[PDB]
C-alpha cells in the first residue's frame, strides 16, 4: 500500500498527514452532538477532511445486528473503534460521538490507535458512566457555549500538529535581526553606495516586510522574465508574482558597481539596505511597459516614471537595515504581514477577508464588505474579520492623499457603516501601478502572504482612464475574470462582485442591473469634487455623513492650494 | 452534518464529490490484490484520495472475531460493505479486495451503496481456476488439495458486472487502464488536459453530411491568414483547443502564456477569429455559422461567443510593443473590434495546390513518418530564412550530441514556416528550392532528414512566439528543439534596434511551463569565421575574425555577380538564391 506520508499529501488541500480520532464520551446527547457537528464544520471550513461516526450512520448499518446485551454493547464500541482507526489511517480526522460509558472499552479504543501509531484524543463531554481518568480534554458543555468548546478542541489539535497553527504561506522578511543590526550598519558603511528615491524606498519596504515572499531581494533576470511572461515565480513551486520588483540603474552607475560583491542603498543620506551578489541586466523599457500595462502610453503616470529610469536593472540578495518608518503620523497603521497575522490571532479570527483601496470608502465598497461578512457567517465561520487595507505607497497626482483617506476611513468606522470591533485598518506599503488585471494579482498575492483567506474583487480593479482617449484603459470585467483563474494563489479564495451604485428608487447602494439602467446614479471622484465645490452633498446613503464632511475639508484645502 | 458537496470540496485538490466503491471480486489468485494496489497508486499519483479494504486491514481488526462458518463468512462481507459505504460517503474512492464469492452477498453490498446514492462498481477479476492454482501465489491451493472457494466451496460469477478483467490475457497496465477509463466515463476520475493530437477535421465518412449542414447556416467570409489559422487548428497544432479561443482561453493565453483548465498546457499566442460590429450583430444569437474562404464553406463554428478585441492591449502583451508599423501588428490593427470563440469543425482537407502540398504534413502524418523511419529521437528546427551553413552547424552539432547520448537513429525535422510572412522575407517556394539544394549537396543528410512545411502564420513576436514554435513541434513528436539567438525576432520598425534581447527566447523556453516531452537544445550565434575559413560559433574576444552575412549583403553579392565566402552556403543553394535575387531586381 501507499504510505501514510504519500496518502497524506493528497487527502486534503493542506499537506502533511494528519489522520487521528477525536473520541467524544459522556452522557449528554446534545453536548456531544453539538460539539461533533461544530467541530466538523470548523474542520471543513479550514480545509481539513474529516468524517463523523455517530448513531445515525453506525446504528442501522455496521452495528444493526447488535442489541443492548453487555456483550453486544462491548462489540458495538469495538466495531466503532476499529472503523475510526481505518479513517485515521486514511488521513481523515475521524470524530466519534457515543456515550461509551466504560473505561475498559475506551482504553481499548485508544490502544487500537496508539498501537498503530495513530493519535487518539479522548474528549470528556462533562454535563453507571465511568469518568475518564486522564482525558486529553474535558468540555463543560452546560457552562461553556459550543464555540468555546470547539476552540478548546482546535487548540489541542494545533498543539498536537493536526491542525496547522497558521496555514498561510510562511513570510520571508528581509530585515536583518535586531541583535545583528548595529554590526550590519557598520558593514554597510564600508561599501560603495547607490542613492535611491522615495518610490524605490517604498519597494525596499515591500521587500523588507515580506510582501513579495519568497523573493530574496530585487529580482534577478530569471525572476523578472518569469514574472513578465507567466505572472508567476516558478523555481521550487508556482507562486503568483505578476509585477516586476526591480532596482534600476544608469549606465554610469552600472559601470561604477558591476564587479562589486556588495553595495549599500542610500535614501536621504542614510544607508538603508545592503544588496549582495548583484547582477546587472537590461531594463528593456518599452517591452516591460507593454507586457506589464498592456500599453506603452507615455502619459500613463507610472509608465512616465519608468521611462525616465535607467537602462539597467540590478538584482540581488537584499538585507534591509533599520526598520522602515515614515514619521508622518500614520506609522500606527503600517503593519507588517507578521504584525497583521498576530493581530488576527489576538482577535481570535477564524476568517480574514481583504479589501484593497486607493480611494475614499463609499457605501458601495461597504456593500461588498458587508455581503462578504454575511456570506462567511452563512458558510460556518464564526468570527470573520475584515482587513480594510488602503494602499499607501506612491499614487498618482489627482488621487486623494493618504492622510485624507485615512481620516475618511476613520469616519466611516465611527459611523458604524463598518464595525470597528471586527475590522483591522492597515496601510499596504506598495506603490500603486494602475495596471488593472496584471496589478490586481499583486494586490491579491500580497494579502495572501499577510494571512487573508478571502480576497474581495469588484469591477475595474486597479484601472484608470486611458490618458489619450479617456476610455477605460482595461475592460472592467477582466480583473475579476483573470484573478479568479490566476495560478499560484492557492491559500485564498477570490470573492467576486458586480458593481454597486446608488439606486435612486431604493435610496441606497445596490448591485447594478442592465434592465433598470436609469435607476442608477454613478458618482465618481470627479463628481464628488464638483458637488463639494458648489456646496452640495451626494445622495443620502451614498456615503456616511461624517466621512463626506472629511472630504469637504480635503476639497476646501485643494481649493486653497484667493481674493481675501 | 456537512453535505457531500462541501466535504468533497476539501477532500483532495480536484473539485467535486467523487465518493464511491470499486468492489473487486474473483477467485484466490485471480489478481485482486495486484489490481487494487496498482489502482490505489494511480489515484494517489493523480491527486484522488482513496482507501483500500483488504485482508491486511479488515481481517485482523474489525473482523478478527469471525471464523469460517457460513454465517461468519456472510457477516465478514456485510461488515466490509457497510465500511465501504462509510468511506464512499466520506468522499473517498474505496477499493475492496475480497473473493466475495456469493451473488447475494455482492448484491447486498451494491444495494447498501445505491440506496444511499453512492456509485458502486463491481469489477470481476476473472481468471480460470486452473490458472489461479498454477499461480498459487500464497500456497493456499495445494494446501486445500491436502486439507476453499473454487474447490470445496463455489464461486458465483457476477451476471452484470461493470467491468470484467481477463487477467490471463492482459497485463497490469491493461487492468488499471480499464478501471480508470470506467471511472472517467462515470465522472469519478477527471480527464486531464492532454497534448495527444486533436484534429478538428470532420471524419471523411461524415464530410458530405457536414458540408450539407454547413450550407443551411449563416456565413462569415474570412481571409487567407484566417484560413491558415483554420489549418493550424484543423491539423492539431494547437491541441487541445476545440476551436477558436473563447474569452477564458484568450485571457489565460495573454496573461499566463498557458491554458489552465484541466492542467497546464503551453499556448502563448492567441488563436482567434475577428469580426466587425456589423458581423457581430448579424451573427450573435446563432448556434452555428459557416466560415467561407474564396466562396467555399470551409468550416462550421458552433456555440460561438463574442468578446472584445482590445487591440492595443493584445498587441502590447503579445509583442511587447504596440508599434503600428510592425507587419503583423499592422494587420491586427485593421481587424474588427470583436473576437469570436467556439467549437470548430473543419470540412474538406486544406490544400493549397501550389506545388508544395507534398511537404504539408500534419502532426499525425509526421509521427507516422518518424515511426516508418524507426527514429529513436527527433530534433526540430524552425526556419523562416534560407538555410546557410551556420544553421547547418546547429543541426549537425545537435545530431552529434544525440549520437553521443546513445540514440542510434536520430532524425532531423527541417521545418520551414509556410503561413503568412512579412514582405521582405524570401518567399516560401524559393526557400523550399533552396533547402532542396542544401540537401542535394549533402550539407544535411536526406536519409535522416524530414523536410516539411509548418502551416502557421509568422508573428515575429520573439520569446512569446518561440514557445508556440516549440510546443507545435512537440505536438508533432519532436523530442529535442534546437534554439539559437533572437528566435522569431526582428528589428524595431521605428528605432532599428532588435525588438527583443537575443538571449531571451532560449532563456524563456528553458523555463516555460508545459513543455513536458522535449528538451531544449540552445546554441550561440554561428557566423563565418575568416581565420578558420568555415562557419563557427561567435566569440567576443576574436570579434574581428567573423564576417556576418545578412540578407541585405546576399542581395548585394548577387547583384554584383559575386559569391559569399567558401563554406558559408552550399554552392547549389547559393545558385537558387541568385535566381531569386534576379527576379527580385525587376
Ligand atoms: N493482469 C493481471 N492483473 C493482476 N494480476 C496479474 C495479472 N496478470 C498476471 N497476474 C498475476 O496473478 C497473481 C495475482 O495475485 P493476487 O493479486 O495476490 O490475487 P488475489 O488478490 O486475487 O488473491 C499475481 O502474481 C500477479 O502478478
Ligand atoms: Cl484598486
Ligand atoms: Cl524563426
Coordinates of C-alpha atoms in Angstrom, one line a residue, chain A residues 1-2 6-7 9-13 36-37 40-41 43-54 56-58 60-65 75 78-80 82-83 85-87 89-90 92 112 221-226 228-232 234-235 240 282 284 286-297 378-379 435 437-438 441 466 472-478 481-482 484-487, chain B residues 1-2 6-7 9-13 36-37 40-41 43-54 56-58 60-65 75 78-80 82-83 85-87 89-90 92 112 247-258 260-261 266 308 310 312-323 461 463-464 467 492 497-504 507-508 510-513:
Chain A
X1 CA 0.0 0.0 0.0
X2 CA 0.8 3.6 -0.4
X6 CA 2.1 9.9 0.4
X7 CA -1.6 9.3 1.1
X9 CA -0.1 14.7 0.7
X10 CA -3.3 14.1 -1.4
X11 CA -6.1 13.8 1.1
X12 CA -6.8 17.5 1.8
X13 CA -5.7 20.7 0.2
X36 CA -19.1 16.9 17.0
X37 CA -21.2 18.9 14.4
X40 CA -16.8 19.0 11.7
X41 CA -18.0 22.4 10.3
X43 CA -12.5 21.4 10.0
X44 CA -14.3 21.5 6.7
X45 CA -14.2 25.4 6.8
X46 CA -10.4 25.2 7.3
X47 CA -9.7 22.7 4.5
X48 CA -9.2 19.6 6.7
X49 CA -11.2 16.4 5.6
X50 CA -13.0 14.7 8.4
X51 CA -15.8 12.2 9.0
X52 CA -18.1 11.6 11.9
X53 CA -19.2 8.2 13.4
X54 CA -22.4 8.5 15.3
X56 CA -27.2 8.0 12.5
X57 CA -24.6 6.2 10.4
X58 CA -23.5 3.2 12.7
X60 CA -28.6 1.0 11.3
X61 CA -25.6 -0.1 9.3
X62 CA -22.5 -1.7 10.7
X63 CA -24.0 -2.3 14.1
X64 CA -27.6 -3.1 13.0
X65 CA -27.2 -6.7 14.3
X75 CA -18.9 -5.3 20.5
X78 CA -15.1 -2.3 19.5
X79 CA -16.5 -2.1 15.9
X80 CA -16.7 1.7 16.2
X82 CA -11.8 -0.3 14.6
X83 CA -13.6 1.7 11.9
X85 CA -8.8 3.6 13.2
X86 CA -9.3 2.9 9.5
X87 CA -10.5 6.5 8.9
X89 CA -5.2 5.5 8.8
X90 CA -6.7 7.0 5.7
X92 CA -9.0 11.9 7.9
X112 CA -6.3 0.1 18.8
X221 CA 16.9 38.3 -14.7
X222 CA 15.4 34.8 -14.3
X223 CA 12.7 36.1 -11.9
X224 CA 12.0 39.2 -14.0
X225 CA 11.4 37.0 -17.1
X226 CA 9.1 34.5 -15.2
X228 CA 6.7 39.3 -17.2
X229 CA 5.8 36.2 -19.3
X230 CA 4.0 33.9 -16.8
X231 CA 2.9 36.2 -13.9
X232 CA 4.5 33.7 -11.5
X234 CA 8.4 29.1 -11.0
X235 CA 11.6 27.8 -9.2
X240 CA 1.8 34.3 -8.2
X282 CA 18.9 45.2 -19.4
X284 CA 14.1 46.9 -21.9
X286 CA 9.2 49.5 -23.9
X287 CA 8.8 45.8 -23.7
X288 CA 8.4 45.9 -19.9
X289 CA 5.8 48.6 -20.1
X290 CA 3.8 46.8 -22.9
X291 CA 3.7 43.4 -21.0
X292 CA 3.1 44.9 -17.6
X293 CA 0.5 47.5 -18.5
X294 CA -0.9 46.4 -21.8
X295 CA 0.1 49.9 -23.3
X296 CA 3.2 52.0 -23.7
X297 CA 1.3 55.3 -23.4
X378 CA -23.5 31.6 6.5
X379 CA -20.7 29.3 5.5
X435 CA -2.1 48.1 -14.2
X437 CA -5.7 42.9 -14.3
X438 CA -2.0 42.5 -14.0
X441 CA -3.0 39.8 -8.9
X466 CA -6.6 55.8 -20.8
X472 CA -11.3 52.7 -19.6
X473 CA -7.7 51.5 -20.0
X474 CA -8.8 47.9 -19.2
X475 CA -12.0 46.1 -19.8
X476 CA -13.8 46.4 -16.4
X477 CA -14.6 42.7 -16.1
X478 CA -11.2 41.4 -16.8
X481 CA -12.1 37.1 -14.6
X482 CA -8.3 36.9 -14.6
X484 CA -10.5 34.0 -10.3
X485 CA -8.5 31.8 -12.7
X486 CA -4.9 33.0 -11.9
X487 CA -2.4 30.4 -10.9
Chain B
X1 CA -23.8 17.1 9.1
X2 CA -21.8 18.9 6.4
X6 CA -19.0 20.6 0.8
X7 CA -17.0 17.7 2.4
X9 CA -14.5 20.3 -1.8
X10 CA -11.9 19.7 0.9
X11 CA -11.2 16.1 0.1
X12 CA -8.3 16.3 -2.3
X13 CA -7.3 19.1 -4.7
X36 CA -6.1 -2.8 -6.1
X37 CA -2.6 -1.8 -5.2
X40 CA -4.5 2.9 -5.4
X41 CA -1.2 4.1 -6.6
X43 CA -5.3 7.5 -7.8
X44 CA -2.8 8.9 -5.3
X45 CA -0.5 9.9 -8.1
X46 CA -3.3 11.8 -9.7
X47 CA -4.4 13.6 -6.5
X48 CA -7.5 11.5 -5.8
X49 CA -7.8 10.3 -2.1
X50 CA -8.6 6.6 -1.8
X51 CA -8.5 3.8 0.7
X52 CA -8.3 0.1 0.3
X53 CA -10.1 -2.5 2.4
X54 CA -8.4 -5.9 2.2
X56 CA -4.3 -6.7 5.7
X57 CA -6.5 -4.2 7.5
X58 CA -10.0 -5.8 7.9
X60 CA -7.2 -8.8 11.9
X61 CA -9.1 -5.7 13.1
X62 CA -12.8 -5.2 12.6
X63 CA -13.3 -8.9 11.5
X64 CA -10.9 -10.7 13.9
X65 CA -13.9 -12.2 15.7
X75 CA -21.1 -11.3 8.3
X78 CA -21.7 -7.5 5.2
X79 CA -19.3 -5.5 7.6
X80 CA -16.9 -4.8 4.7
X82 CA -21.0 -1.2 5.4
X83 CA -17.4 0.2 5.9
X85 CA -20.2 2.8 2.2
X86 CA -18.9 4.9 5.0
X87 CA -15.7 5.6 3.0
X89 CA -19.9 8.8 1.9
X90 CA -16.8 10.4 3.3
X92 CA -13.0 8.7 -0.8
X112 CA -26.4 -0.6 0.5
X247 CA -12.7 34.6 -23.8
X248 CA -11.5 32.4 -20.9
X249 CA -8.8 30.8 -23.0
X250 CA -7.8 34.1 -24.7
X251 CA -7.3 35.8 -21.2
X252 CA -5.2 32.8 -20.0
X253 CA -3.1 32.9 -23.0
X254 CA -2.4 36.6 -22.8
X255 CA -1.6 36.8 -19.1
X256 CA -0.1 33.4 -18.4
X257 CA 1.1 32.0 -21.7
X258 CA -0.8 28.8 -20.8
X260 CA -5.1 26.1 -17.4
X261 CA -8.4 24.3 -17.3
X266 CA 1.7 25.9 -23.0
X308 CA -13.9 42.4 -27.2
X310 CA -9.0 45.0 -27.1
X312 CA -3.9 47.9 -28.1
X313 CA -3.7 45.7 -25.0
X314 CA -3.4 42.4 -27.0
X315 CA -0.7 43.7 -29.1
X316 CA 1.3 45.1 -26.1
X317 CA 1.1 41.8 -24.2
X318 CA 1.7 39.6 -27.2
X319 CA 4.6 41.5 -28.9
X320 CA 5.9 43.7 -26.1
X321 CA 5.3 46.8 -28.4
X322 CA 2.3 48.5 -29.9
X323 CA 4.3 49.8 -32.9
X461 CA 6.9 38.0 -31.5
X463 CA 10.2 35.0 -26.9
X464 CA 6.4 34.8 -26.8
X467 CA 7.1 29.0 -27.2
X492 CA 12.1 47.6 -34.2
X497 CA 17.4 48.2 -32.6
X498 CA 16.4 44.5 -32.1
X499 CA 12.9 44.3 -30.8
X500 CA 13.9 41.6 -28.3
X501 CA 17.0 40.8 -26.3
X502 CA 18.7 38.0 -28.2
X503 CA 19.1 35.6 -25.3
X504 CA 15.5 35.8 -24.0
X507 CA 16.0 31.6 -21.6
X508 CA 12.3 31.7 -21.7
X510 CA 14.1 26.6 -20.9
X511 CA 11.8 27.6 -18.1
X512 CA 8.4 27.8 -19.8
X513 CA 5.6 25.7 -18.2

